[PDB]
Design a protein around this nucleic acid. Sequence first.
DNA 1: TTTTTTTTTTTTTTT
Length: 1937
Amino acid sequence: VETISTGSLSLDIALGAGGLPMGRIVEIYGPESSGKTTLTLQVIAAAQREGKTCAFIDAEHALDPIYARKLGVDIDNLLCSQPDTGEQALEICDALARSGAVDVIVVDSVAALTPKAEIEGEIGDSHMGLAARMMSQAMRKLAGNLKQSNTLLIFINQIRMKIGVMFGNPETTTGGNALKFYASVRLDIRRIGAVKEGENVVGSETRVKVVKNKIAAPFKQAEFQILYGEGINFYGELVDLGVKEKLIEKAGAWYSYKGEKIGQGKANATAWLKDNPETAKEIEKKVRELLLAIDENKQKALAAALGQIEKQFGKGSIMRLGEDRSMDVETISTGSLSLDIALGAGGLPMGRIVEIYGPESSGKTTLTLQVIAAAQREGKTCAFIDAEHALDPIYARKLGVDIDNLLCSQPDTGEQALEICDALARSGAVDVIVVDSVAALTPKAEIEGEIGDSHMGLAARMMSQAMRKLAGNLKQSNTLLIFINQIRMKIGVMFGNPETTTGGNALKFYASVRLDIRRIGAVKEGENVVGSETRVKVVKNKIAAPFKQAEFQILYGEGINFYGELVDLGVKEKLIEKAGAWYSYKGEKIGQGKANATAWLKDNPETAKEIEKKVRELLLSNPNSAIDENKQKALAAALGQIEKQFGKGSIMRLGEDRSMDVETISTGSLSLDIALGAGGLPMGRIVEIYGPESSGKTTLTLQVIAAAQREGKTCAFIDAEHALDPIYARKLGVDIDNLLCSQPDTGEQALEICDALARSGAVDVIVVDSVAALTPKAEIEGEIGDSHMGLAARMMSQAMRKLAGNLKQSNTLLIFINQIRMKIGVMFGNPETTTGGNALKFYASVRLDIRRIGAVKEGENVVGSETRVKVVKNKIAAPFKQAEFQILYGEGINFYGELVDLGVKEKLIEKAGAWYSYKGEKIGQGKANATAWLKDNPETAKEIEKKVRELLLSNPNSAIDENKQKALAAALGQIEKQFGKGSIMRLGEDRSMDVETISTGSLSLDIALGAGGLPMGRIVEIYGPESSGKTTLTLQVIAAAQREGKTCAFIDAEHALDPIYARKLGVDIDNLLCSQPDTGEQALEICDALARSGAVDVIVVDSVAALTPKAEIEGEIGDSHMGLAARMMSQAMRKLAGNLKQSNTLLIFINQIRMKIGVMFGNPETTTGGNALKFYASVRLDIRRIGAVKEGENVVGSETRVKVVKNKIAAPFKQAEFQILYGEGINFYGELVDLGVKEKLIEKAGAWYSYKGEKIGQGKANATAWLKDNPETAKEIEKKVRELLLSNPNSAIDENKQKALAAALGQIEKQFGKGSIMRLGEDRSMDVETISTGSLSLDIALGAGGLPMGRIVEIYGPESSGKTTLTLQVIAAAQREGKTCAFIDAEHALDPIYARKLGVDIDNLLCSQPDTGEQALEICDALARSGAVDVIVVDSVAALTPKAEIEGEIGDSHMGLAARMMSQAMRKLAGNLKQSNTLLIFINQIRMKIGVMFGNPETTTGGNALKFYASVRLDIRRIGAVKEGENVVGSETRVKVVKNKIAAPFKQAEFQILYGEGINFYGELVDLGVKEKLIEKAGAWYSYKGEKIGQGKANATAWLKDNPETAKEIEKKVRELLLSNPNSAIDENKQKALAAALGQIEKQFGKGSIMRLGEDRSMDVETISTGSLSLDIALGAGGLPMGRIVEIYGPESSGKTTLTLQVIAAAQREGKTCAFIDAEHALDPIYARKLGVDIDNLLCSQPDTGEQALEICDALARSGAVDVIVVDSVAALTPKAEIEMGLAARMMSQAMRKLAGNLKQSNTLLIFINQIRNPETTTGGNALKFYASVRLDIRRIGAVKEGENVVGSETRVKVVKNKIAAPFKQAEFQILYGEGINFYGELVDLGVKEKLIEKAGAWYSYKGEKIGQGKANATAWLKDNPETAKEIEKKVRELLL
DNA sequence: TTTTTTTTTTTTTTT
Ligand SMILES: Nc1ncnc2c1ncn2[C@@H]1O[C@H](COP(=O)(O)OP(=O)(O)O)[C@@H](O)[C@H]1O
Ligand SMILES: Nc1ncnc2c1ncn2[C@@H]1O[C@H](COP(=O)(O)OP(=O)(O)O)[C@@H](O)[C@H]1O
Ligand SMILES: Nc1ncnc2c1ncn2[C@@H]1O[C@H](COP(=O)(O)OP(=O)(O)O)[C@@H](O)[C@H]1O
Ligand code: ALF
Ligand code: ALF
Ligand SMILES: [Mg+2]
Ligand SMILES: [Mg+2]
Ligand SMILES: [Mg+2]
Ligand SMILES: [Mg+2]
Ligand SMILES: [Mg+2]
């Protein structure tokens, strides 16, 4: 075992044997740029440092001599071979081994050991693993000759990935397994990081694993540094090793040796060991010890082997490196100086391969051409492989390229492409070949195969074979090869960056330079975009230091600003002077501004060269180092060679390529054609148009079709979107009869059609409506919810690959329409993207951003989309120029409109005010008349058009047709024969295409729709507010569809459809299919299967917002499934549109409104389920409730407005206003009436409505009920109305339906369960089951007699309104019926004892005080899912604080984090609620939206989410008092029904809430009995059936209480009379799933997460003294509740702070700790003391910010260490930002949210003092008001006088809020200054009022004994006798508590 | 024998 150094110690160490074994084989493999070759050379260096001879086989053809030298290699003494064939390569190894003259041979890249046969055969064939069997034969031979020569052989090898293997790692080596075995060492080298000189990248942090070892232990690893231009940091390691082995001292940053300090920092420990090699050896050796006639026989057999190899293989087969002339680093200009500088070697190396990759439009091709220009500027010949089929000749010229002298190939196949490269290299006639897009090097097999055939990485193995071949022919031809490549992302990767190149890793390695070009910004002429600010990174470099970057400008139509750079570089290097704006050279002023420094160096090229060169000298760390008739002889022999192999025009000069020409078509928009620069869309290229839904994508598309068919070209349309209107297409000037149209099933199909249409060359222009609808086969056949991640994309990238070629050689223009989608979570630039991956982006020769920017108005009517289109990609002319115009609906682009404007701006048309003139002659007054005259004179229009074009374009235009229709109808029939009958046909004769429309159930709507209804086979979205009428309208189109014998399906994803109501809307309940799906996936898969059956005519989906993804449901509430919803929608749309159109099944989606937070443009209204829907929808509907329809008192109708916000069917934006009567629906005939009136079809003489003379009814109400009565007349009127106002009029059978219906039924049932889908009429879980509210009039107003089971109910209202109360009362009357209730006291303010006084079973009531809102809801979820709870209630959604918010600080902006939590919760809950028949009540608080000037600024918390899902929304309010004369005993209360899905809404309920009793149920009963004549009222007496029941309502109350028999009897008959929606082994299955859910919740969230109320110990009403007895008395509960929040407010000087301190005193008197937040900055310590406060023990904060203030509260609560915190003045809780507009409030509301929880579980009482600002209010918004369990109105009412001196504030304190006892009781006492509350003072008064103390005038007596004359003396005596005081105190307490 | 290609929003906030 003889070992050589590796040149890396840690490596030698990891090797175990101290190096690489002699006579053995070693493989080093690793990534491109890893350091394979480097390491190699370093073992060579340290072998030549020991007098051993090395040979190098640069099979890679990429060894840098000069570098080799910088690595310590003896260049002059190193043998070097650049062998042609691998065989050669190895035979050399063999002969060098056999000589025994070489000690170490290395082979740079076995991957480049190309077999003979492979090189002399083509690129593409099957010589498969010929490489390997060569390796295995070589190994076989070599090992023997190696050991008996003790010759060490190193193989460098590359990494390759074998497709589709998922065992461990798909990393492999080249040259088969052969090597692997024979190797005695295998080495995994890698670059792991950077070594940085701060800015400069100077080193490859490198790791090398021993993956095979026959020499010592394997797998030991070695980590070190490879400094570029030096090699391995040997001493670097030495250092570390010395450190680890205690040979070098490290005291912090200082490194010592034997006591003597060697350097501070590792960088200085390095440079000292370098300086002292004596010491280094000494350390090196001791480290090693610790961790591990002779030479003239050589040179005689050396030179005999030399000559042997030379004699077999040719002249310079092998030679010394130092004297290799073909080896030299020859560099070409890039056309960018800073680039040449960053390259280090001044350019791109000749004979090597260079890859340039970067984004679409980056400048890849551009840069390419610029190196071509500057190569042709030096008399070198260039070849171009436009595999991309998108090189602009004319542009090439503008870049300085010699078009006439530049070779150009547009190859069909990639193989072809490369074989051309090969033959051009082999000729040595081309100096530089470039390949535009390896990504377009489509393999033969792929082109001939279909789109969708998996040729997985066939591309790659082609590349790896090509590289193999090319590098050799490149170096011996000194031919530089540039590859342009595209960016693609590898899906699912979580490391580093998912950016990659095409054509596999192959390229990466072989490349001697790899270039990351990018567009980083704009270069602006102010308005015009003229330049791509561009950055190019050197990502691979074999030539000099990598990673140096180059930043410059690419001016369009000029190229790289070469001199631009020169300038800057001159500036930075002090070669050019810059004094402000002036640029000087050698004193002489060259230009003011960089723009003038540019144009002067351009003007003086003598000076430029002089500067260029000196710059180069200064910044290049790798400087440059019968003749031409031998070229053109082998040029034209290769030319003809390529021509003879591949066809006529396989290759030719650019200047004379006729298929190349930039031929352009009109867009149908002039300004667009102008912005395009080239006057239109390029033929044979691909164009992408993307933009918003309704933008005009499809429209524009058709308009280029029109103007193409206007020039006799044939167009094909791929309506992948399944939403093209034939009739409309016609109105756009399209030849419907002559336009090919495909509605393909699969995207593959779609594209294969494109392919076959291109290949025929018969179509001139194909357009594809929505790549976003190019659904892959696998996706359609698979389910919705199957992850086919970017299957779409790899389909696109394969399609592009194929199409571009067939497009250019067919001059067929391909337009792709695409949609916008957002990439979630991105914080840079704009989150706008396209579908179908980046693929498209690159291939496109034009990319178009169309948008709707405004309206075009005929005053009232919306008639036009003011439209803007940006050129975002341009390969044709200058990009980014924009085009603004008008799209009139039913006409298209106002072409002439533009013409006009353009004529105006260019002085071709005269404008004198309003008159437009041409050549003097007046053409029209107003633009509208300038329009209609140019329309009338097309001769003049052309004349103007052309001259405009001449003036504003910067790239002007430059047996035949029976060959088309012969290959047309052969392709037609081809497509028809592959894919079916009507796969493709002329538009004009498509019967499935027809715009078939259904009634909406609203005429004015059908009218506004323009086409008389909703289109069949299309998707319609209806969105709008909660209660708007979405579901309603839905059902009404269902009714009028079932009225025409069509079958409807309903997806009640919302879980809130009323069967009974559905019926009242005219829906056939028995015949209506209904699904309440669990998951959205389910929901959609149902849609899919219903569409696919073609058995349903119309499916509707109630709330996409409720299409909860599987993962979301199974996951928790609070798990971020960000837009998982969306990608589900976008997959669903993709699938559905196809199955919808071929089933003519109309799909309606109902969706909800949500706001996007933080947006300052337009309107923050949006839809759920992402943009997906928006596009696919053929109609989008904005429904709204705008007003009331009133029967005087009763609210009976939703005055309703519906906007058409999207329309693919007719003109959009027309609006429809009508009435939705509850329990009847839309008043269809209502409209009919109005419409008849407006159109003079019905007569109106005042109030009388007449028809044809005959009087039909007085009043609209009577015109209604008569048309209802005569449907004959109604139809007759309906139709004539329609004729008059529609600018888009209407245009064995059924046993095939019910056969595929019941097969789909059973299909859905079999996939998803029993009652997944069924007829409405027989759904038992659907039934409207109602619970009592505990308030009759409420149950009455509800219409359905109570709250619906399985639904969600929101009750909102003011603080103290009675929200919680009402809640409990429905709980009581639910537990009174044996139902189980759960309570989520998120508010942390439910009184157990009170709950009891309300009739609630405390012992049987589940109660949760959850920490987080997530928790809160997850509890709801688990309680619903158990089905064990019948009714859950949540006290304050406003207290459902999100985790993040709780853990985050108060003042952290979690903007509407609350909401997205709610919307996720709703999503989840409604389903689990209905299938558990569990009623969920949410209590919520009122908040105001600031700055709103409409209606009412009242809102709810937790976003709109709740609002929609709720089946009932309840506005409770306190309206007045119920008085026992003096005492306030009752909250006179009013509750509005603000949402109702259950019966008629808006009916109101007024009643009484007695405190300590609850709702006076019977109270209502009484009134109701009175109003309904069931109870007699003769004045004050109330009678029943004659018998007198009580005088006064108070006595009518207490008698019904006493006779519950009579009460039920009255109750029921009342109910019968006023409800317009009447009511419709068992319990041991409950308590079994109850206690399993109990334990479930307990096990997830902790011990006392949930428990019975009666046994909650943290719940207890624990009270503290206020320091004022009468106050404690008025409080009712004897003080302030612990764990709750209390607000005390009152006037300045009132005594707020005082009182505060007094509760503190009496808390510290009971050994509790108090904290004070003197936010007011005005607490007197000394005074605090005089009030009995322990100053030394009282915590005090004077916080700067309110946030601070609260965060302190939070942390004090959370510690549970403070018992009572007080905050002096919320009014002084100034928000941070306000030091640095109700910012105050949203801070309060966030604080409350957080605090209440931490307060109750800490039993920490929080007092807030607040100020006053009846117009009396508090600061810090309503937030406080609600959360407070007590609110206190303190006031100073008078003086307490010592005669003269004022000594006391006579003080009054009202209880204005109380959750603890009866409110409103008041407390009057004295606050003596310097003493505080006169405790005994009160005692006195109280004693007086309660007859415990005698008062005979002025004398106060106790038990007869006289205690003092005057209250002042009754005071000072009780002070003196505390025994007596306690005795009185206690008896008072007994009496009044 | 040698990769293949993205995927799609998310939800108010509070005198
Ligand atoms: N024919 C042309 N006329 C004017 N500008 C062009 C032309 N072709 C491309 N450009 C512009 O030059 C820049 C780089 O183009 P290019 O190098 O073709 O992109 P890629 O890197 O995708 O090959 C882009 O901003 C593009 O808009
Ligand atoms: N523990 C209690 N004892 C007596 N009365 C109470 C108690 N809690 C609340 N009240 C009274 O009942 C009415 C409604 O209280 P509540 O429903 O808690 O208000 P909210 O609607 O804010 O939840 C109020 O007038 C209040 O003063
Ligand atoms: N530093 C002080 N020394 C003596 N008396 C004070 C002091 N501060 C306040 N007072 C008196 O105590 C009473 C209540 O003060 P305070 O509670 O601060 O009023 P507010 O209710 O506005 O906070 C007032 O009559 C005031 O004059
Ligand atoms: F074509 Al669209 F929304 F994608 F109308
Ligand atoms: F004394 Al003040 F609010 F007026 F604390
Ligand atoms: Mg190398
Ligand atoms: Mg290009
Ligand atoms: Mg469209
Ligand atoms: Mg609804
Ligand atoms: Mg409450």
